[PDB]
Write a protein that binds this ligand. Structure first.
Ligand SMILES: [Mg+2]
Ligand SMILES: [Mg+2]
Ligand SMILES: [Mg+2]
Ligand SMILES: [Mg+2]
Ligand SMILES: [Mg+2]
Ligand SMILES: [Mg+2]
Ligand SMILES: [Mg+2]
Ligand SMILES: [Mg+2]
Ligand SMILES: [Mg+2]
Ligand SMILES: [Mg+2]
Ligand SMILES: [Mg+2]
Ligand SMILES: [Mg+2]
Ligand SMILES: [Mg+2]
Ligand SMILES: [Mg+2]
Ligand SMILES: [Mg+2]
Ligand SMILES: [Mg+2]
Ligand SMILES: [Mg+2]
Ligand SMILES: [Mg+2]
Ligand SMILES: [Mg+2]
Ligand SMILES: [Mg+2]
Ligand SMILES: [Mg+2]
Ligand SMILES: [Mg+2]
Ligand SMILES: [Mg+2]
Ligand SMILES: [Mg+2]
Ligand SMILES: [Mg+2]
Ligand SMILES: [Mg+2]
Ligand SMILES: [Mg+2]
Ligand SMILES: [Mg+2]
Ligand SMILES: [Mg+2]
Ligand SMILES: [Mg+2]
Ligand SMILES: [Mg+2]
Lengths: 100, 63, 51
RNA sequence: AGAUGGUAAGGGCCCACGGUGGAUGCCUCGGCACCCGAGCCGAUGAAGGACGUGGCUACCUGCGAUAAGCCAGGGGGAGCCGGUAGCGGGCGUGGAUCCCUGGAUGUCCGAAUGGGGGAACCCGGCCGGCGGGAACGCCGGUCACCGCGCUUUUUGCGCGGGGGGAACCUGGGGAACUGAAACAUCUCAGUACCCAGAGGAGAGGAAAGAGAAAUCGACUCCCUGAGUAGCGGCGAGCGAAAGGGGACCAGCCUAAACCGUCCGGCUUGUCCGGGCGGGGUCGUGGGGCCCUCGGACACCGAAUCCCCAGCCUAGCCGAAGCUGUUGGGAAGCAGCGCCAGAGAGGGUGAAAGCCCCGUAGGCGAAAGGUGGGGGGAUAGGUGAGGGUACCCGAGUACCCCGUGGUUCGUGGAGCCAUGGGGGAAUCUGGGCGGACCACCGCCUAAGGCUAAGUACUCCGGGUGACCGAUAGCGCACCAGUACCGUGAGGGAAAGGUGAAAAGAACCCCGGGAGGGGAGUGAAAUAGAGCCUGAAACCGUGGGCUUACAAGCAGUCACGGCCCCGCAAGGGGUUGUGGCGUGCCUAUUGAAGCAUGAGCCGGCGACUCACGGUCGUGGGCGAGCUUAAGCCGUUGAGGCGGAGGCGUAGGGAAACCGAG
């Protein structure tokens, strides 16, 4: 509980470091470690694979998780905090001064 | 906590208004049999002390 | 000590006896503006005593 | 004939570099302390356990054969199938996972309770079901004991009890060391411990009180009274009360006389007794019965019950920034802005009010727990005068013998309690006011209940001139564990890679281990019990040095050799000469053949509380100062003269007083 945070799975900007300013859709969000997967931080893994099954695994430089605080949501206007407004029924969330 | 006044000493010694201690003359109750009228009279009056005066002060302090 | 302290700060010439308070409500902007015209640029710590 | 460089099997000193080892620094989920909140659980089976449960499960956690969980009501709004990745297979906006409330299931042990028992095992009776099911086995329900009321009897029916709890609480028992510089009375102490009981508290409690005021007015706790009164082998020591000031505030039911009634007993009566109802509850004495009053409408009003506010048990909203600049990484530096009832704190690759979480401020409950805070109802309760003299708590008061409590140790020894013996009275009664008498005066025993103020902290929260892994709880880490004991019981060590695992693919030596490349990284003497890495201790390389030498190992001088500097000079080494009895403790005296220390590193010893005494800084000064506590605050101060020290001493005291 309360583990919830900023954004979810959608468009997001990154003001981190090695990939500052960059932008991309957040494909994953692990709340336990409080970090999300985007398209910025991507490091090369040399390991063949931990599991013997499927001989080749990949020297892949896949996406590495990223602290969910360095990433910020976005809309028509670039980079905005998050306000919330209970709809005429539900509970949607509006940006700095616009909808959704 | 709270120094207890030495009752054994108060019942037998009163301090002067100044700072001196006074008590009755010793030897006058038992040894008696037929001593010179001087002795018995000399023993009638109280007296001052010296160093141990300070000692007995440190008892009747709250008093 | 209390009076002496007050008398000290006053002797230096800092004990101001205000009364006018354009600060209608609990809004910092108002005070910051009131203090600005009060001669309080913020370059000095102050003990704002008031009821 | 003479003279004097070289030589190192090894050793020494110094310098560089590594190994070992884990000090120091910094870090902190943990711990400590205080404050506030909250406070019982159990035969509807508790506390605490055993066994079992995941597709693959060793342990922890969760759960209980429906066994990482099932049903429903809320909360929440994208992810989820615990720590836990991987093989393998799924769930989620038709709103899951998670959190809060209720419910269901809940093996076997355990108060354990059908019986037995070496706890988690073994064996049954009664009813009903299952398998062909009479022998066998399984499943559901049920059967322990004790207490009280019902049951006329027997047997049954119902209600309760049992056990657990860190500390606190009451009652029944109850030490010794130690102090007294011995010891025996005393002290330690009614403490430790044992035992039974009670619940968020317990106890105590509406005067047979206190004690001298022709006064106060239950009880409990805090100031004070006071180290006073007293106690005491008058030794060591022990140690009240009244009164004043505060918190809190609360007062009630019954026994008896007397009336009705039901039951059974007999010596049959106008009665004895038991059960129930009415009546009655007092110390200006009260009540009963009869008479008179008009004696009814109101007046009092719960501690019990009903509704509600509020509160705990999940949560939600929530102001304000963007580009440059150095870097592995901005939040640092710069430039130009903004919010603030929010500039507390935490995180984000480093140093952030405006990035994330928050904070100020303000929202929220279907359900469950609390709730006189507010309101409502019910119980119960309210008067006068005269007469009558009926009643007012029994092996009790009272007295004596033995004793405990109290400040009271037999003291002149009362009072409160009571093991033994004797043993009354009912207001012309009876206790007490410190032996006794008298007078004056307080109070109504021998029946019970009563909130609050008070104590404690297993549990939750907040805070800290509290610790920071040899500290802090014994335990920051799967610790009451490993290990040690037959058993009570004893009881450790052990934390840190990095911003991210990007945890080093692939080649080479090798059996492996471990290395050398390469690669990741800002960093690899950050490379895996891996941050910082001190010291003892081990080792290689280099400078100087030593095989005719005698010693607390050093110091003083000269010289040679090696190294830094423009020079003079400074550093390392030691050839020769001079001089020289280690440290500590204990002692009249130690180099001592007196004690202690193998070496390094870390933990380790004059504190605090209250009271006293002198000095001292500072405020006030015949005055000075407040204590509990109330108000305020949320790291604010203020009020509060009850009380204490001082202004007069002297005497044993009556008393007198600059004497
Ligand atoms: Mg004479
Ligand atoms: Mg005094
Ligand atoms: Mg080397
Ligand atoms: Mg259980
Ligand atoms: Mg299995
Ligand atoms: Mg698992
Ligand atoms: Mg019958
Ligand atoms: Mg002894
Ligand atoms: Mg002895
Ligand atoms: Mg005693
Ligand atoms: Mg009580
Ligand atoms: Mg109090
Ligand atoms: Mg007291
Ligand atoms: Mg004592
Ligand atoms: Mg009655
Ligand atoms: Mg009545
Ligand atoms: Mg006595
Ligand atoms: Mg008796
Ligand atoms: Mg009574
Ligand atoms: Mg009570
Ligand atoms: Mg510290
Ligand atoms: Mg053994
Ligand atoms: Mg390093
Ligand atoms: Mg030299
Ligand atoms: Mg020694
Ligand atoms: Mg000797
Ligand atoms: Mg000496
Ligand atoms: Mg020696
Ligand atoms: Mg010796
Ligand atoms: Mg030795
Ligand atoms: Mg002192």
């Amino acid at each position: 509980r309360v583990k919830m945070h900023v954004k979810k799975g959608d468009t997001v900007l990154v003001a981190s470091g090695k990939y500052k300013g960059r932008v991309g859709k957040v494909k994953e969000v692990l709340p336990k470690k409080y970090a999300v997967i985007v398209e910025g931080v991507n490091i090369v893994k040399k390991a063949v694979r931990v599991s013997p099954k499927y001989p080749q695994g990949g020297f892949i430089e896949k996406e590495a998780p990223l602290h969910a605080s360095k990433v910020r949501p976005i809309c028509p206007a670039c980079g905005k905090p998050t306000r919330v407004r209970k709809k005429f029924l539900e509970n949607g969330k509006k940006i700095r001064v616009c909808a959704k | 906590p709270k120094m207890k006044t030495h009752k054994g000493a108060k019942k037998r010694v009163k301090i002067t208004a100044s700072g001196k201690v006074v008590a009755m003359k010793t030897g006058k109750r038992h040894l008696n049999w037929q001593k010179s009228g001087k002795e018995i009279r000399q023993k009638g009056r109280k007296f001052v002390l010296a160093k141990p005066e300070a000692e007995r002060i440190k008892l009747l302090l709250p008093y | 000590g209390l009076a002496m302290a007050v008398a000290d700060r006053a002797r230096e010439g800092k004990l101001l006896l205000v009364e006018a308070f354009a600060g209608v409500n609990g809004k910092t902007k108002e005070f910051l503006a009131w203090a600005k015209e009060a001669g309080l640029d913020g370059s000095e710590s102050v003990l704002l005593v008031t009821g």
